[PDB]
Amino acid sequence: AIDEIKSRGYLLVGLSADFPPFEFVDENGNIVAFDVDLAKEIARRLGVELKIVDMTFDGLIPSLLTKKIDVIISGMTITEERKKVVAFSDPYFDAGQVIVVRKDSDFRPKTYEDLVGKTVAVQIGTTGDIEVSKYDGIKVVRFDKFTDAFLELKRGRADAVVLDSATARAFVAKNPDLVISSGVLSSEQYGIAVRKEDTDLLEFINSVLRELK
Ligand SMILES: NC(=[NH2+])NCCC[C@H](N)C(=O)O
């Protein structure tokens, strides 16, 4: 809780920095982008310093539950399944899943059904993984890091990547060989995850988000 954060002198924020425009590693090795700046605002308003801890996305809730981080600010969708294990702030971004393919491939899937019979790369433990995993006949290939999922697609070892719309746009801008084939397939909102007992921290973060909006 806040007493504990004040006592070490800094907020510990967990994320996976493979997710522009929310968090990524720049060419100097620094972790930057929207969530980083959100983290900084929260810390400044709390009156403490900030430490970002980059890890695998699917390790973030494990890290939060074991108190190795205070909060997750990592483009994380608020889900009923996750609301069983953690608390979320008010939402701060709307997105949904899309399908990315190679422009040179002779296919342009529009729906999850269109990926039946195809090999689809996802980042493990994302809402994208969760969705494609429900469809029998999609062969899912799962990666800790989105960079590796895109390398799989570029190299032709997968047919498609499924991931959130804003990040899909960022990866396709970097990779003119790739294209978003589908419209948006889900209605998701991002929130900041806090341990359920840390009601003080949740409240404070909600107040910061409200002032920002
Ligand atoms: N920093 C990241 N890699 N974030 C992945 C988030 C994907 C999706 N919004 C989810 O919550 O599962």
Numbering used by the authors: 20 to 232
The study reports:
The Gly52 residue in C0 position was replaced either by Ala (TmArgBP20-233_G52A) or by Val (TmArgBP20-233_G52V). High resolution data, extending up to 1.64 Å resolution, were collected on TmArgBP20-233_G52A crystals. The TmArgBP20-233_G52A crystals contain one molecule in the asymmetric unit and, as expected, the protein presents an arginine molecule in the active site. Indeed, the root mean square deviation (RMSD) value computed on the Cα atoms between TmArgBP20-233_G52A and TmArgBP20-233 is as low as 0.29 Å, although the crystals used to solve these structures were not isomorphous. Determination of Ala52 main chain dihedral angle values (φ = 117.3°, ψ = −170.9°) indicates that Ala52 assumes a conformation closely similar to that of Gly52 in TmArgBP structures. This conformation falls in the ε region of the Ramachandran plot, and is considered to be strictly forbidden to non-Gly residues. Moreover, as in the parent protein, the carbonyl-oxygen of Ala52 forms an H-bond with the nitrogen of Asp56. In TmArgBP20-233_G52A the distances Ala52Cβ-Val51O and Ala52Cβ-Phe53N are 2.8 Å and 2.9 Å, respectively. Since it has been shown that backbone geometry may show a significant level of variability, the local valence bond geometry and deviations from planarity of the peptide bond have been compared with values detected in well refined protein structures. This analysis unravels the occurrence of significant deviations from average values for both peptide planarity and bond angles. Altogether these findings demonstrate that the significant destabilization induced by the Gly52Ala mutation is caused by apparently minimal structural perturbations.
Among others, the arginine binding protein isolated from Thermotoga maritima (TmArgBP) contains one helix insertion motif, with Gly52 in the C0 position. The structural effects associated with the replacements of Gly residues adopting conformations forbidden to other residues were here evaluated using TmArgBP as model system. This protein is endowed with remarkable biophysical and structural properties, and presents a helix insertion motif located in the D1 domain. The helix insertion motif is locked by two consecutive C = O H-N H-bonds, made by residues Pro40-Phe53 and Phe41-Asp54. The Gly52 residue, which occupies the C0 position of the motif and presents a well-defined electron density in the crystal structures of TmArgBP variants, adopts a conformation that is strictly forbidden to non-Gly residues.
